[PDB]
């Protein structure tokens, strides 16, 4: 169908509600294949969580993973 963005108008792509990390940028936070169709969605900013903060709670690791990453 036809979707209007702040970047412009994006035809041929259906607009969905849920958000993922995004592959092809368009602009104004809208990125775009999934399930035999071009979708368009606002960017997921990342996974969301809240840490269990209080004034006397500390969290200390017990184990550790050594990891090797390129650059």
């Amino acid at each position: 169908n036809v979707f209007q963005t702040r970047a412009g108008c994006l035809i041929g792509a259906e607009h969905v509600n849920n958000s993922y990390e995004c592959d092809i940028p368009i602009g104004a936070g809208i990125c775009a294949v999934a399930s035999q169709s071009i979708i368009a969605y606002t960017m997921s900013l990342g996974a969301e969580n809240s840490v269990a903060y209080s004034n006397n709670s500390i969290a200390i690791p017990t184990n550790f993973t050594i990891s090797v990453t390129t650059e």
């Binding site: 702040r6 990342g46 500390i58």
Partner: protein, 215 residues
């Protein structure tokens, strides 16, 4: 203050040079693949702007959330924490204090990240650092009370950690007074964002003289 990006200006070649003219374009094609090169260069710097903003702000793996209770041992962070009304107050002073076209070929493209999305990155970045410290920048976020985090931050500069704990309210008052003076100086004193205004003024100057070369 540091600048991280420009405005993404993409031009057209035949629209700027000729513009609804078949004869001018037919003479322009004798010059070769010149404006393909010019469009490629401007497209390259326009995607470099998004690369810049992503490498500055998008450093968090996950978006962190401020706790509803704000009892950080006496420290008052409500002057930099984001507000549910609109952003943080200091970001509102910055957005007001900076004093920022599309005529023929000259277009601006929007950035990939909206200003609210960059605000959500900065909210996550400064809500992780008041509830975890640096441990959300190494592994998973591990909670710690904020006087204890400030105690080890004192321990990292050569001062023993007691010195915070007998002087905690004095440090809290000094922190709050310093943040309030930052808000007052940004609210009253102008021309402090000159570094962040020179980039916009230089881009406007270059686009304006590119327009005036048409006459």
């Amino acid at each position: 203050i540091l600048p991280v990006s420009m405005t993404k200006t993409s031009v057209d070649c035949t629209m700027y040079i000729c513009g609804d003219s078949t004869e001018c374009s037919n003479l322009l094609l004798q010059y070769g693949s010149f404006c393909t090169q010019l469009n490629r260069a401007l497209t390259g710097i326009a995607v470099e702007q998004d690369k810049n903003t992503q490498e500055v702000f998008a450093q968090v793996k996950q978006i962190y959330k401020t706790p509803p209770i704000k009892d950080f041992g006496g420290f008052n962070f409500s002057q930099i924490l984001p507000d549910p009304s609109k952003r943080s107050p200091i970001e509102d002073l910055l957005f007001n204090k900076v004093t920022l076209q599309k005529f023929n070929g000259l277009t601006v493209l929007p950035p990939l990240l909206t200003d609210e999305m960059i605000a959500q990155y900065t909210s996550a970045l400064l809500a992780g650092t008041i509830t975890s410290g640096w441990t959300f920048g190494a592994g998973p976020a591990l909670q710690i009370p904020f006087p204890m985090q400030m105690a080890y931050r004192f321990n990292g500069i050569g001062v023993t950690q007691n010195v915070l704990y007998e002087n905690q309210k004095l440090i809290a008052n000094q922190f709050n007074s310093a943040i309030g003076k930052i808000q007052d100086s940004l609210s009253s004193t102008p021309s402090a964002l000159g570094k962040l205004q020179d980039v916009v003024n230089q881009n406007a100057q270059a686009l304006n003289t590119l327009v005036k070369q048409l006459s």
